[PDB]
Design a protein around this ligand. Sequence first.
Ligand SMILES: CCCCCCCCCCCCO[C@@H]1O[C@H](CO)[C@@H](O[C@H]2O[C@H](CO)[C@@H](O)[C@H](O)[C@H]2O)[C@H](O)[C@H]1O
Lengths: 49, 1039, 149, 50, 49
Amino acid sequence: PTGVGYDWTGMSYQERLSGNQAPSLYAISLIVVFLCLAALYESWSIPFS
Amino acid sequence: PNFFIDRPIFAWVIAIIIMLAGGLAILKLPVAQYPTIAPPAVTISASYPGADAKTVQDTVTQVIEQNMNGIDNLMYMSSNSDSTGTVQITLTFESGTDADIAQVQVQNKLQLAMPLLPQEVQQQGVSVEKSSSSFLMVVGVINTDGTMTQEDISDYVAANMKDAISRTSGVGDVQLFGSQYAMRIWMNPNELNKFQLTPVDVITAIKAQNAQVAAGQLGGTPPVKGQQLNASIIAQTRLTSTEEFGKILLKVNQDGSRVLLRDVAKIELGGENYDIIAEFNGQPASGLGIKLATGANALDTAAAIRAELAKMEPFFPSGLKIVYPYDTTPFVKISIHEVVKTLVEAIILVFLVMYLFLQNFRATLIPTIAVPVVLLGTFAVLAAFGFSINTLTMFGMVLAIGLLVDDAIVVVENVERVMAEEGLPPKEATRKSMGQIQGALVGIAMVLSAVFVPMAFFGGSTGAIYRQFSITIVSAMALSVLVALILTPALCATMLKPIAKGDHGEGKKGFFGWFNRMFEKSTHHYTDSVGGILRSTGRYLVLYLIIVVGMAYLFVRLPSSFLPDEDQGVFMTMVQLPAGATQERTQKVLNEVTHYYLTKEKNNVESVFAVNGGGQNTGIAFVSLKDWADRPGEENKVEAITMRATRAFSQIKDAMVFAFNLPAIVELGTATGFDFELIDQAGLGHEKLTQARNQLLAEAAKHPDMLTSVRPNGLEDTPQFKIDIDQEKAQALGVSINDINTTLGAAWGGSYVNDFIDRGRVKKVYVMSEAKYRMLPDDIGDWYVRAADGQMVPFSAFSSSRWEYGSPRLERYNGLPSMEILGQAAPGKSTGEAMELMEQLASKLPTGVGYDWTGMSYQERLSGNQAPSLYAISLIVVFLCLAALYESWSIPFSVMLVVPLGVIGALLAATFRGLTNDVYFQVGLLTTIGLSAKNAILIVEFAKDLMDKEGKGLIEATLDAVRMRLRPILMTSLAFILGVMPLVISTGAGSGAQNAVGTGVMGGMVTATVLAIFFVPVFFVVVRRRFSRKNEDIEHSHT
Amino acid sequence: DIAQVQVQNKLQLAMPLLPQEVQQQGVSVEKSSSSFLMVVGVINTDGTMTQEDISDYVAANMKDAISRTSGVGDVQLFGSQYAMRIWMNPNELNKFQLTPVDVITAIKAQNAQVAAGQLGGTPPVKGQQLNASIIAQTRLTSTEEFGKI
Amino acid sequence: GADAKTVQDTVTQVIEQNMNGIDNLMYMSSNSDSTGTVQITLTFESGTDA
Amino acid sequence: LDTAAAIRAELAKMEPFFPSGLKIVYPYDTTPFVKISIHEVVKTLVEAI
Ligand SMILES: CCCCCCCCCCCCO[C@@H]1O[C@H](CO)[C@@H](O[C@H]2O[C@H](CO)[C@@H](O)[C@H](O)[C@H]2O)[C@H](O)[C@H]1O
């Protein structure tokens, strides 16, 4: 009924945390690797390739 | 550097990364109006019901000032002992101490003296609190139907909202203003003398019939073997209603009928205490003071608290509505809105200059990219070092905009300048040009951070204040020189368009460049001229000395504020009734004040909070004003508002009432002025010291040419009421003195006796006299004390009564008896001098009359001997760095000599606006100096380069140099002064700052550069004439 | 600091289980030294005063601000502060039919402050004009007034 | 000797209103027993100074 | 050496409100030694230069 909600805590809280962390983490990490290659290698292309 | 010219995209990558660290830093960057600035203060508060000033000073105040030994980093200890029975001891610690550790040490030394306190104090509370007087917001609570009083609303407040406000995001401390529902029994004296009863019986029976009892449990361990049942055994449950307390027994008569509580007194859920009485526009109200969480954003906490109350709005009882007296937040949104507008605006202006001078969209696109970055990164390094977006940090940004604007400009310019001069394709041009300005750039970085780090190391609140700017600006400057060394040269080599040798695009533009000629012509005019002013020198040295001396005179004749007072959307008008006054009179003058603001300020005043604030004797009104867009004019602003209000309450009253606007940062050293503390040190009487204070009243009032407005900061003695109990007569009749005093006490002050439990919240239970039977001294006759053998004795049988004098508010300083004395320096004179004359006057005072400083006068007494040492370090570090950059111990003087030329024009205009030598003015001063020196440096170096690496003469060289350095100096100062312009001519929110910064700066830039482009080569050329014969002249060499 | 406060914390778990003589005579928690950092001496050349007078001056004018210096662990006082000292006469006590108990209880009665009160105290009556302090049983200041006990 | 709904609206709920402005707090959870016990657990941001 | 200097300022401050003839004396203090002892290491370093 109305106003009866849910949560995870302890164990399940921290795992909701790793879920919530997955996408941004491959986002940031993937985008860094990009910069680093475009930087070491003077190319815009090698990063897309 | 040279490196990135060929590695542009490496440059872009670092740019990007600084940007994303920046943008990230910016998305999640805290905001408040000002950063934490005040030394840590913890106040211990406790109340002793019924007590007078000396009772709380001499039973509790002192037991704590004796047990507060060995706590880390004590700065000073200061206590009020109010006749309301409350005692408040303020411990301020060394600036930058762990707030928390301090407080816990304090709370624990307290928890150890706790057994040497009286019993009422122990049960009434001793609290240890961090004392920031800065509440993020005050929400007022009202009822449209006017259904309830204040005590009801108040209890509602304590019962429903503080829970859901304190759960709101960003809300740190939540505080309750008012008295909750407590069980209030108003005794009836005649009704009690009736039945052979005293307050003793009242209290004692009340204790019997209302508590819980050490309960017990069935099947309890260890049970018997094979046991079966185990559950809770309910005992004496605390009483729920008045209706049950009426029926509690006080005395059984012979003929059986019982005498209940209901009989002898009026019984009601009442207020816990009724000293403080509040109206929001005449409608009764209670209030909440919300403090922002630590490391929290102010504006969201505002918006969240607001959505939180708005949802709860429909479940408010009949007619109750939420209102807003106080909110630092909307002003914060608008000041910040205006700083962003500025930074962006200066960017647009730089664009307009760069275009309308270099007239090529790509060139103008570069600096456009440079600053957003330096901005972001700066935002980031400050994010890294953990600052916040406050007035000090953002205006610390504005002040550095000139350095950013200039760093980018110098480079793009010199490059273009090189192509236009020589006809290299863009790259080789940029390499050449970076080649020209590189050594300078690292140099400038070193001289700039040489004037900006020393100001960081200042001490106390002022030093904090400075550290904000110092760091803000070293970061902006740092990132901008690097951007200048890494990206921008690469941006030039890349997106910059080649310009034909000997171009200058002279004329050609029928529609446009009818200007380029004008500027070319005037540029030779210019060279012509400067050579002429090196042709004879003397005049211009005199002229210089003139300017310097003027610089100084003006300097002396300048005012010294701390921070400008700003129209902050709210202010307060505080009220003081004559000594001895009552609630109703004070209250009267308040209703008159309130109605006045609502009358003769109908177009302005939005709302008034009247706080008849215990003690009675004083009252106070917190005042709200409508949004800034509906108070446009000059007479509609706080200046005028407060003036017309003090005009109102000046003559026409029997009570003194002033109306004022607040300092910006709440805990402000009042500029010219001081906090003197006069201390008693010999086992001396309060009498003697008060009379000593009178003496220094006479001695400081006799010196108007130094000191101005010297005052005590407390409430003077008032007459009090002495009731001398003939103990003999009491031991005679057989009455117990414990019973006489404890009954008397219960009668006029009251006694906290029990707790009760209403609706599922535990609340207090007091017992006092009904109003009308404890008011005027004759009421003493109305009360009775029963002996051990059982008979009634009126009080006028065993006591004598009289009037006398006493002090209601007993003050202490660092453990000893003292009297606090505020004061400021004569209209012209300085605080330091005044403080000195105060020492010479107070030196006239008695043995056991010693003196000391605190707070404002403390902070101002120690870290003010730092100014000269820090600018000594600055002069020497800056000098040493330049001595390195040029290869001379002497040439540095040719650039250090410009420093007055900018300073002079700043104070000029600053006096012409009659502003004040404040922080904003001063960091401005530096900034001004700083660019004056950068440009001086670029010119000096260019000259020298010509002399050396080309073997050009000295005079020709200076000419050439200054010539190639004319076009940029102008572009920048042009851009700057033109972006800054709005700071000077802007009102709207908070523009006291905007103007204060802007003025000195703009004036500064005008005289700075207008002087620079003539005095620099003079400075150079003369100073350069204290060096070697052969070489001299010069013009051969060998590359 | 942290240590001091955890230890002081377990000490609060022992505090209501300690007697009142102990509680009111003083329990102290110190992160202090092993030995003496220094010893400050207080004297009088002319010998105008005895020694206990000097001592009183030491706990009355001086000791409080020394134990508050930042960085000072403990102060020890070589001597005692002035306290109102009553030395009973035993035979004199059997004489008048009295014991030390009477002494204590009576001394408690004739010497304290008391929840006094206020004329015009809130809530006053409508149209009230007076609001002032009611002075009560004052604690006794001198030896002589202890004589009359 | 006290009961549960007694300890919670006299001791527990009184404490959770003073736990405002505690830094690096993740979640708050409290038990209120008639065995005489009342118990409050504050779990904090991962890595907070204990 | 610092707690020392602070106790000096507090005491020097307390001197004047003392009664008739009172004087402070110095029986014990580890400090003058610390200062003067490290000071002789200094005289050394310099003369040695
Ligand atoms: C912002 C763009 C820059 C262009 C602005 C040009 C205006 C210059 C304003 C102030 C500079 C002083 O201007 C200059 O003063 C000196 C006088 O010492 C003149 O110099 C002249 O006078 C003195 C004698 O009086 C002679 O030794 C000198 O040979 C002679 O040519 C300059 O020819 C004159 O132009």
